[PDB]
Design a protein around this nucleic acid. Structure first.
Ligand SMILES: [K+]
Ligand SMILES: [K+]
Ligand SMILES: [K+]
Ligand SMILES: [K+]
Ligand SMILES: [K+]
Ligand SMILES: [K+]
Ligand SMILES: [K+]
Ligand SMILES: [K+]
Ligand SMILES: [K+]
Ligand SMILES: [K+]
Ligand SMILES: [K+]
Ligand SMILES: [Mg+2]
Ligand SMILES: [Mg+2]
Ligand SMILES: [Mg+2]
Ligand SMILES: [Mg+2]
Ligand SMILES: [Mg+2]
Ligand SMILES: [Mg+2]
Ligand SMILES: [Mg+2]
Ligand SMILES: [Mg+2]
Ligand SMILES: [Mg+2]
Ligand SMILES: [Zn+2]
Ligand SMILES: [Zn+2]
Lengths: 97, 135, 24, 76, 91, 17, 113, 252
RNA sequence: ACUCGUGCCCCGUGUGGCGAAAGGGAAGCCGGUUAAUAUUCCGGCACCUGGAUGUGGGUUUUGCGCGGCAACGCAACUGAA
């Protein structure tokens, strides 16, 4: 919650992430994703599609409390983002909880 | 992990067969020279069996319970995977990416798919596979 | 297609059936 | 009016019941020979460049058909 | 390059109708001709269609709102009061 | 004892002509 | 060459049915030709965009052209665009699945007593 | 003299209402079994504008409980509704903006619009842009509810009357000046033939009671009794008082 | 269907007309011709609607077509309430 902004910035610095909807689905198909984030105002049909893929590949999903505008800013970018995947956690412990 | 295995049941999303349900015969996670992307080789149902009632006669029962199959190679982006599986020993190496180069080979493959799918349906298993989707 | 269009086709079938009977 | 591509189809057209007449038009300035046959719905035209097949085609037509030669400056 | 000192958008009215009336209409014209950020898709494409109808150019959604603003303070206050009334009593 | 009626609308019966 | 023209029918007014265009004839004259109105493309029944692969005609003209020219080979061939057909299939599957899990959870976890 | 202007309007020849561009009237559904014992839902399909009115309207599609078809209704739009939204109607509906439920199922202080005077007449009260009614109190033993109206008056209504949660969309329309004669003309050109308007004091005695004279003036008191004859009622009818309102208004 | 009209069987919430030679709307173009008509006559070359119908081609040996990842294509390629 409060510390997600802190943990997310660390994964950006050390680990590797993938941004967007088309790439997130490709990551889930390969089976190498460990954690996905879904923004608050994503369309409900898309939101249910992402969650069903996660159930198939057994990866946890965390529901971000902000819009697509501030999910992008939390990643240090200058553009909106509605969903993302994490391929590896670096010096961060975001996978622990 | 991996769910696009060789027994997964999926739904086609685009094309002439949009809305039908298929079983994966062989996954290809790396693109070949043709189709340079993730794709799969599947067999499916084009015309589902018709409805059946306890009051019908044997001759009318057998005439209504018949299936029309098809074979296809599809991009992964045009599939929707489900949580069901259909493991049949009759469909092991029916299609191997070269049957799609000879029309005579396509007919033989579809002839075999019809024979195997028909017996399983009569047995009374995997009813979700043989029931059409309403959308 | 419109109903008058479909009525013509079934009318032809009925005539053909009675004529093929008359032939037989 | 419709165009015919080959010779075999044009011969088959002329062997039809509703074939009324045929005519031959030659344009010497551009060295062309045109064969036209008048049918119920359409007029069919066949265009030839050489002149060694025109007489060969002419004798291959059915004998009951009427063939003219389209004189220059046709009278009203 | 400022090209106008104070009249602003109400410079189309020339020297007519009185100074006080031009100020009052200026307050409502500015807010009804502006763009607003969509609540459903996030882009900055929402304009007024009719006197109480606001539509998004990107995701094609239309919403019922105020006469010259997307939301009114009375409606905003009521939504919170309704939310509190239902929630803190039934939940 | 009376007949069943599946509609709430009454229609004039059919008679010989 | 700069010759003026006249209407060829009794209507002298410029209405939405008095459409004409200029031609030149094999007799070397400037005339007028009376033309119909342009066809309109059919639209998708969900989002309202122009369907690809279907001609734009006046409504009576669709009664003569063949069937394969008036449709595309897919479920909801006409009247839906294909993006909408994709949404219908996915939405129908996901909602139907949640229906089963909600039923099983409600029956088992709450009617065990 | 001759018949005066406000007498001619009851005949209805050039004083009727223009109705070519209006598609339907705004009403609830007819009260039925589903809304008396449970709920049903429908989908908002479009938000439209109909001329002569503020307060945009909403097109909602429901499903028939007894026949295989669907029915399209026309409601008045509350602020915050959008296309693609589910709304619910009945006794067991939830306390969310855009729902329709009987007043017996709402707590005191809630705000509703398009309130039925009696259960089944499909809506009479508070249906204009930026307006609403307020629930004040209940009376369960006899089944009555007290409400407050936009004019400031109090009323008592049976508890089975229906209303829609929220405020009527349309906001503060009357805040900006019309500022031009043409703007007022466009407003009434789609309602009725009532614009412009000549002053009675500028006509001739044959035309209006305020008549003629060598100066423009009325000549007698402008307050007219309640029980007067048609042709005499021109001015302030049955006026309790007159003049600039200084203090607060005691009546509520 | 009638032996032959007579007899059977379904559905039902709703049920008239007049009103536009500028609104909506199936289908024709060029050349010639008379003292005086013509997109109407003559010559050539087309199109629409309605009604009957036979050849060629298409589909089906396990019954109602194939191709393209796809947008879709091809002379056809069952479909009542
Ligand atoms: K086409
Ligand atoms: K009088
Ligand atoms: K009323
Ligand atoms: K007037
Ligand atoms: K006046
Ligand atoms: K004066
Ligand atoms: K005066
Ligand atoms: K007309
Ligand atoms: K004559
Ligand atoms: K044949
Ligand atoms: K074929
Ligand atoms: Mg009207
Ligand atoms: Mg005077
Ligand atoms: Mg008098
Ligand atoms: Mg008096
Ligand atoms: Mg006077
Ligand atoms: Mg008439
Ligand atoms: Mg006309
Ligand atoms: Mg015909
Ligand atoms: Mg059909
Ligand atoms: Zn938007
Ligand atoms: Zn669409």
């Amino acid at each position: 919650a409060q510390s997600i902004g802190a943990k997310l910035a660390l994964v950006i610095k050390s680990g590797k992430v993938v941004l967007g909807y088309r790439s997130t689905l490709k990551a889930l198909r390969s089976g190498k994703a460990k954690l996905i984030l879904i923004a608050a105002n994503t369309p409900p049909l898309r939101k249910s599609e992402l969650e069903y893929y996660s159930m198939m590949s057994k990866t946890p999903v965390h529901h971000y409390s902000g819009t697509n505008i501030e999910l992008g800013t939390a990643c240090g970018k200058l553009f909106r983002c509605s969903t993302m995947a994490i391929l590896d956690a670096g010096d961060s412990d975001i996978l622990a909880d | 992990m991996k769910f696009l295995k060789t027994s997964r049941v999926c739904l086609v999303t685009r094309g002439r067969y949009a809305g039908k349900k298929v079983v994966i015969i062989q996954p290809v996670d790396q693109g070949t020279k043709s189709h340079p992307y993730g794709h799969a080789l599947v067999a499916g149902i084009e015309r589902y069996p018709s409805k059946i009632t306890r009051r019908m006669s044997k001759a009318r029962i057998e005439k209504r319970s018949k299936i029309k199959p098809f074979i296809k190679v599809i991009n992964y982006n045009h599939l929707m995977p489900t949580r069901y599986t259909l493991e049949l020993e009759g469909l092991k190496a029916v299609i191997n990416a070269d049957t799609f180069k000879e029309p005579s080979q396509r007919e033989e493959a579809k002839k075999t798919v019809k024979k195997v799918l028909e017996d399983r349906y009569n047995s009374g298993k995997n009813r979700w596979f043989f029931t059409p989707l309403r959308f | 297609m419109r109903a008058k269009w479909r009525k013509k086709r079934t009318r032809r079938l009925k005539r053909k059936r009675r004529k093929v009977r008359a032939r037989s | 009016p419709q165009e015919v591509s080959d010779i075999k189809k044009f011969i088959e057209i002329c062997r039809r019941k509703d074939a009324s007449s045929a005519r031959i038009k030659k344009n010497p300035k551009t060295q062309q020979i045109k064969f036209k046959v008048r049918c119920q719905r359409f007029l069919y035209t066949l265009v030839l460049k050489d002149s060694d097949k025109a007489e060969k085609l002419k004798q291959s037509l059915p004998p009951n058909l009427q063939i003219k030669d389209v004189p220059k400056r046709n009278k009203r | 390059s400022k090209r106008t000192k104070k009249v602003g958008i109400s410079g189309k009215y020339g020297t007519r109708y009185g100074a006080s009336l031009r100020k009052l209409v200026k307050k409502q014209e500015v807010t009804q001709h502006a763009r607003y950020t969509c609540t459903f898709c996030g882009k900055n494409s929402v304009r007024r269609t009719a006197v109480g109808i606001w539509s998004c150019k990107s995701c094609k959604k239309t919403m019922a709102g105020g006469a010259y603003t997307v939301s009114t303070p009375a409606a905003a206050a009521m939504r919170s009061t309704l939310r509190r009334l239902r929630e803190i009593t039934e939940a | 004892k009376t007949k069943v009626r599946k509609s709430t609308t009454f229609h004039r019966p059919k008679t010989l002509v | 060459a700069p010759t003026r023209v006249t209407y060829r029918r009794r209507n002298p007014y410029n209405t939405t049915s008095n459409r004409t265009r200029v031609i030149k004839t094999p007799g070397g004259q400037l005339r007028v030709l009376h033309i119909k109105k342009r066809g309109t493309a059919p639209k998708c029944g969900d989002c309202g965009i122009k369907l690809p692969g279907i001609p734009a005609l006046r409504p009576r003209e669709y009664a003569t052209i063949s069937k394969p020219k008036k449709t595309v080979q897919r479920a909801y061939g006409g009247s839906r665009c294909g993006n909408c057909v994709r949404d219908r299939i996915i939405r129908a599957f996901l909602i139907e699945e949640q229906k089963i899990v909600k039923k099983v959870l409600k029956e088992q976890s709450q009617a065990e007593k | 003299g001759r018949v005066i202007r406000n007498q001619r309007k009851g005949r209805g020849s050039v004083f009727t209402a223009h109705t070519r561009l209006r598609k339907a009237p705004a009403k609830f559904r007819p009260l039925d079994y589903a809304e008396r014992h449970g709920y049903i839902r429908g989908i908002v399909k479009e938000i439209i504008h109909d001329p002569g009115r503020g307060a945009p309207l909403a097109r909602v599609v429901f499903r028939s409980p007894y026949k295989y078809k669907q029915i399209t209704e026309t409601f008045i739009a509350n602020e915050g509704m959008y296309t693609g939204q589910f709304i619910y109607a009945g006794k067991n509906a939830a306390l969310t903006v855009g729902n329709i439920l009987p007043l017996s199922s709402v707590p005191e202080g809630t705000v509703v619009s398009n309130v039925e005077e009696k259960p089944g007449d499909r809506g009479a009260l508070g249906r204009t842009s930026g307006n609403y009614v307020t629930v004040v109190g209940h009376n369960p033993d006899e089944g009555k509810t007290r409400i407050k109206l936009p004019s400031g008056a109090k009323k008592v209504v049976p508890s089975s009357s229906r209303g829609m949660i929220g405020i009527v969309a349309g906001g503060g329309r009357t805040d900006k000046p019309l500022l031009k004669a043409s703007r007022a003309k466009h407003k009434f050109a789609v309602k009725r033939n009532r614009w412009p308007k000549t002053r009675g004091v500028a006509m001739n005695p044959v035309d209006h009671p305020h008549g003629g004279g060598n100066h423009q003036h009325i000549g007698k008191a402008s307050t007219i009794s309640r029980y007067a004859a048609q042709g005499q009622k021109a001015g302030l009818i049955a006026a309790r008082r007159t003049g600039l309102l200084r203090g607060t208004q005691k009546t509520k």
